[PDB]
Amino acid sequence: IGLAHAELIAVVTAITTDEPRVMTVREGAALPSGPFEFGHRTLQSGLREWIHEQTHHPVGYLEQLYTFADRNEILGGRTISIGYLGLVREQEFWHGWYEYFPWEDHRQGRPDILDSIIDKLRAWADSEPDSRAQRHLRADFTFGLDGGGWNEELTLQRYELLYEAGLVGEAQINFGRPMFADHRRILATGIARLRAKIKYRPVVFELMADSFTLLQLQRAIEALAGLTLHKQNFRRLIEQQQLVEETGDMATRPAKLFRFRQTVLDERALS
Amino acid sequence: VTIGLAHAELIAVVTAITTDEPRVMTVREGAALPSGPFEFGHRTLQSGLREWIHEQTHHPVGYLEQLYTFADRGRTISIGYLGLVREAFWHGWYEYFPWEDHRQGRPDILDSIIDKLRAWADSEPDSRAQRHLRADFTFGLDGGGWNEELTLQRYELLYEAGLVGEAINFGRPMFADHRRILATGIARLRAKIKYRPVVFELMADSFTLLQLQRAIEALAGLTLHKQNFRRLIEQQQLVEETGDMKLFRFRQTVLDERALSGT
Numbered sequence: 001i002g003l004a005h006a007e008l009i010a011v012v013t014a015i016t017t018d019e020p021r022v023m024t025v026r027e028g029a030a031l032p033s034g035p036f037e038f039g040h041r042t043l044q045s046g047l048r049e050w051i052h053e054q055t056h057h058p059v060g061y062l063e064q065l066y067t068f069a070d071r072n073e074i075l076g077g078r079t080i081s082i083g084y085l086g087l088v089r090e091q092e093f094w095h096g097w098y099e100y101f102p103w104e105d106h107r108q109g110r111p112d113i114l115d116s117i118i119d120k121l122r123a124w125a126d127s128e129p130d131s132r133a134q135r136h137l138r139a140d141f142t143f144g145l146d147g148g149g150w151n152e153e154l155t156l157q158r159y160e161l162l163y164e165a166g167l168v169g170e171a172q173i174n175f176g177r178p179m180f181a182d183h184r185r186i187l188a189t190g191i192a193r194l195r196a197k198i199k200y201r202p203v204v205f206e207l208m209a210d211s212f213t214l215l216q217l218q219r220a221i222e223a224l225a226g227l228t229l230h231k232q233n234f235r236r237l238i239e240q241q242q243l244v245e246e247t248g249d250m251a252t253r254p255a256k257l258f259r260f261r262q263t264v265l266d267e268r269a270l271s
Numbered sequence: 272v273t274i275g276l277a278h279a280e281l282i283a284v285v286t287a288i289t290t291d292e293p294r295v296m297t298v299r300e301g302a303a304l305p306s307g308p309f310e311f312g313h314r315t316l317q318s319g320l321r322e323w324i325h326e327q328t329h330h331p332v333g334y335l336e337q338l339y340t341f342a343d344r345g346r347t348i349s350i351g352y353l354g355l356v357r358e359a360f361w362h363g364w365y366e367y368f369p370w371e372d373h374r375q376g377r378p379d380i381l382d383s384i385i386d387k388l389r390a391w392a393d394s395e396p397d398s399r400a401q402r403h404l405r406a407d408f409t410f411g412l413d414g415g416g417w418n419e420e421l422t423l424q425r426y427e428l429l430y431e432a433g434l435v436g437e438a439i440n441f442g443r444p445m446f447a448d449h450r451r452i453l454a455t456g457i458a459r460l461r462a463k464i465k466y467r468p469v470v471f472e473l474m475a476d477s478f479t480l481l482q483l484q485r486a487i488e489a490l491a492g493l494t495l496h497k498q499n500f501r502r503l504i505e506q507q508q509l510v511e512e513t514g515d516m517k518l519f520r521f522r523q524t525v526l527d528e529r530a531l532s533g534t
Contacts, residue, residue, distance in 0.1 A: 002308020004279035006348055036342070037275050043342045067340040067350050069309070069316045077276050078309055080316075080348070082340055141531045157533060200466055270408045271424060 003077030006036035008047035009183065011083060011190030012059055013097075013224075014090040015207050020097040020223045021090065022187060025054045028095040030180040031187065036082070047084055055093065059086045060206045061268060065189045066156075068182060083186040085193050087206035097191060098226070100177050100184055104155055104191065105226040114143070117167065117175055121145055124165040152225055153195050159188040194224050201241055203268060205260035211247050213255040214238075277346040279309040281320040282449065284351055284456030285332055286490075287358040288473050293489045294363045295453060296354075298327050301362040303446040304453065309350070317534050320352050332356055333472045336534055339455045344448065351452040352534075353459055355472035364457060365492075367443045367450060370410075371422055371457065374494045381410070384434065384441055388412055391432040419491050420461050426454040460490050467507050469529060471521035477513050478520075480504075 010032045012023035025032050034050030036043060044062050051059055065083035072078070098105040102113050122145060125135035139145035142158045163171045163185070169178035170185075178184060198204065198221050207220055214235065222229050238244055244258040251257050283305040285296035298305050305320075305327045313319030317335050324332050338351035365372040369380050389412060392402035406412035409425045429435045430451075436444040437451075444450065464470065464487050473486060484500050504510050510519045 002279055002310055003276040004309055004348065005274050005276055006279075035275055036277065036346075036348070038346055040342070043340065043348075064339060066337060067316070071314065073311070075274060078279065078311065078313075080279065080309075080350075137527075138531060141528075157531070160533075266404070267408065270405055 005075060005077060005079045006043070007033055007079065007081050008036055008043060008050060009033040009081055009083045009186045010047055010051050010059075010062075010086060011065065011187055012051070012057075012086040012088055013190065013194065013207070014088050014094065015220045015223055016090050016094065018219045018223050021094045022097055022100075022190075023051075023055060023057065023088075024093055024095050026180065028093070028099075028177075031183045033181075033183070043082055044084065047082075057088070057091060059088055062086045063193070065186065065193055068185065081182055081186065083189050085190045087194075087204060089207070089209070097187070100179060100187060101155065101159070101191065102176050103158070104152070106150065106152070107222060107226060107228055110150075113175060117162070118143060118145055120167050120173060121161070121165060124167070152227055153192055153199070155192040155195070156185070156188045159185060191224075195226075198224055201243070202238070203243065203260070203264055205265060205268075208260075211249065211251075211257040211259050213251050214258060215255065217244070217258070277348050280306055280347060280349045281309055281316060281323060282306045282349055282351045282452045283320055283324050283332075283335075283354060284338060284453055285324065285330075285354040285356055286364075286456065286460065286473070287356050287360050288486050288489055289358050289360065291485045291489050292363045293365075293457075294358070294360045295367075295456075296324075296328060296330065296356075297359050297362050299446070301359070301366070301443070304449045306449070316350055317352065328359060330356070330360075334529060334534075336459075338452065338459055341448065341451060349448065349452065351455055353456045355460075355470065357472065357475075362443075364453070367445065367453060368422065368426070368457065369442050370425070371419070372492045373417060373419075374488055374492060377417075380441060384429075385410060385412055387434055387439060388428070388432060391434075417493075419493055420458055420465070422458040422461065423451070423454045426450060461492075464490055468503075468509065469521075469525060471526060471529075474521070476520070477515065477518045480510075480517060480519055483510075483519065 014021050023032060032051045032054045036046050040046030062084045065085050068081045070079045103111055103117055121139045121143060125139050126132055136146055138161055140148040142154050142161050144150060162168045167173050167175060202221055218229050218234055243260060243264055245261050247257045247259050249257045287294055296305060305324045307323030309316060309319050321332060332354045333356055335352045335354045338353050341349045370378055370384055372378060388406045388410060392399055392406055403413055405428060407415040409421050409428050411417060430438045433439060434441060437448060468487060484495060488494055509525050511522050513520045
């Protein structure tokens with residue numbers, strides 16, 4: 001009783017040409033993934049082995065994302081999916097975040113694909129009168145169907161509402177490029193996690209080179225958030241959090257080069 | 272096709288604050304957290320855990336948020352959930368984690384812990400530097416400062432050093448690795464109250480601004496500065512006055528935000 005099969009799924013993010021990119025196998029149709037096996041010492045060590053065989057690309061630190069369950073008797077138990085988030089520098093299968101989630105990028109203004117999404121959500125929310133108000137409240141909180149503001153952290157809740165409304169191909173109407181199994185749900189969890197991270201403490205040294213300009217760091221955070229940053233409040237956050245320091249070198253308008261502090265790297269290594 | 276299977280356990284960390292003491296829902300005379308397997312009939316992981324909570328405690332539970340998924344140290348996969356309720360709650364956090372309560376200042380048990388951690392860090396000379404860095408970052412072995420959020424990192428260091436019974440023992444042990452789950456829940460709550468304290472499920476319908484701090488102080492295991500505590504609440508726009516007696520209340524936008532965020 002109480003048996004389950006566990007799949008480990010990796011969301012490995014890089015930033016290339018100011019675009020957030022996720023590591024993929026299957027020609028961009030799936031994330032790197034594999035079953036948790038008896039010989040795997042930990043869940044994370046098991047996933048590291050699956051990333052190695054499928055991509056042979058190095059990965060640094062990993063943080064656990066979320067555990068999802070299926071909603072089957074022949075398998076002997078339920079199936080669970082455990083997602084992890086990793087930040088790396090791309091090395092010479094890398095597809096952009098917003099290929100799968102085009103509505104999540106508002107850097108150059110609200111994307112036009114949202115108009116079509118709002119239209120389909122409204123019809124779904126009005127299709128059943130006894131659930132009308134309860135569905136308008138969810139679609140406004142996540143997508144602003146009634147005029148609510150945009151919260152870039154709600155990436156998962158947006159995708160799950162589209163799934164529940166049958167507006168993504170995985171729900172079997174589709175928006176964005178689908179992925180095999182529940183992998184877009186895992187990717188949406190990784191996007192939301194990283195956006196919660198950068199809003200309060202953007203420790204993203206694994207995404208940057210050893211040294212970088214503040215403009216490079218700003219563009220990297222903007223790519224992850226899918227929004228343009230307020231230049232001043234961003235630079236005050238970085239300084240208040242004591243995250244970076246000048247290296248003493250200049251880059252080319254000349255600009256000083258910065259690195260994340262050793263204490264920031266030390267604290268991450270010991271977590 | 273050959274599919275591997277493991278035991279799937281759901282573990283609850285349900286916390287209430289009474290008499291300015293953070294307490295966790297336990298079963299079996301405080302030796303364990305409410306737990307149960309993930310079965311076929313369970314629609315979701317959360318609904319399966321709610322069935323075990325009601326069956327084992329018969330105490331109502333409000334919102335639940337997923338904590339962390341652990342493999343055992345057949346395999347066992349443990350999925351923890353955190354819950355905040357209004358008040359078995361006879362056992363506080365610090366019966367199991369006495370070194371995590373610093374509101375009376377640095378607890379005396381840390382002296383014995385620091386002594387044993389130094390001997391473990393000095394046991395092998397090639398790893399002494401890293402072990403001192405780990406123990407100073409988690410416990411302050413070399414004079415480092417205290418970080419209340421590192422409750423999980425502190426426990427797994429004690430486990431790795433053989434300083435808790437589950438691995439010498441400090442604090443009350445629990446069955447299996449339920450101390451690992453409670454540590455994760457304590458760390459989650461202390462991270463939540465630091466940035467944006469949404470704790471309306473722990474507080475009364477109405478409360479004063481001083482009652483709000485002693486609750487937050489109980490969770491963080493630290494005493495806070497009064498003026499700096501209120502500025503955080505003025506900033507995040509979480510509270511509003513009630514007119515009665517000041518008595519305060521959590522705003523409806525905060526209560527609706529949590530109702531729609533899910534688990």
